[PDB]
């Protein structure tokens, strides 16, 4: 069971690229957009790229990238519904929310009013 993680604002899909960068794209055919949600218990999950095997990570400086280190505390997320199928993706270690910006860049913010922190999660067939 895989999912897509999509910006409510622009419809861009979150992607991890071969070079390790995390960004957004409209390309539904890009192999980097499929994720797997891994339950960590206690309301925590990992978000793993199927293509690269990396777990999404928000770093203390607000940058977002990937890692295969399952012990990295920056890979734990909470999926927090806002209602009607919209969610926030919150980093447990930092409290930052994942943000996809209109220009396709991805980073972390503590601004709950930012349009870019609203995600839809849809199942892949």
Resolution of the model in angstroms: 1.4
DSSP state at residue 41: E
Backbone angles phi, psi at 90, to 5 degrees: -105, 125
CA–CA distance, 109 with 113 (Å, rounded to integer): 10
CATH 3.30.700.30 fits 1-125, yes or no: no
Q: Residue 25 and residue 17: Cα distance in Å, rounded? A: 11
Residue 50, both tokens: 């199927």
Name the nearest CA neighbour of 23 among 75, 97, 99: 99
Domain positions in the chain are: 1-125
Are 24 and 15 in contact by the 8 Å Cβ rule? The answer is yes
Nearest CA to 72 among 90, 92, 52?
A: 92
Q: Please state, in angstroms and as integers, the Cα–Cα distance from residue 10 to each residue in 24, 33, 68, 73, 98, following that order.
A: 10, 15, 29, 30, 15
Q: Are 116 and 4 in contact (CB under 8 A)?
A: no
């Amino acid at each position: 069971h895989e999912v897509l993680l999509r910006s409510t604002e622009t419809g861009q899909f979150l992607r991890i690229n071969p070079d390790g960068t995390v960004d957004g794209t409209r390309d539904r055919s890009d192999p980097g957009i499929q994720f797997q949600i891994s339950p960590e218990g206690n309301g925590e999950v990992l978000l793993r790229s199927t293509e690269t095997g990396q777990f999404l990570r928000i770093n203390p400086d607000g940058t977002v990238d990937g890692t295969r280190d399952r012990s990295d505390p920056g890979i734990q997320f909470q999926i927090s519904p806002e209602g009607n199928g919209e969610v926030l993706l919150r980093s447990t270690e930092t409290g930052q929310f994942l943000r996809i910006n209109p220009d396709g860049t991805v980073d972390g913010t503590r601004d709950r009013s930012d349009p870019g922190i609203q995600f839809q999660i849809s199942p892949e067939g």
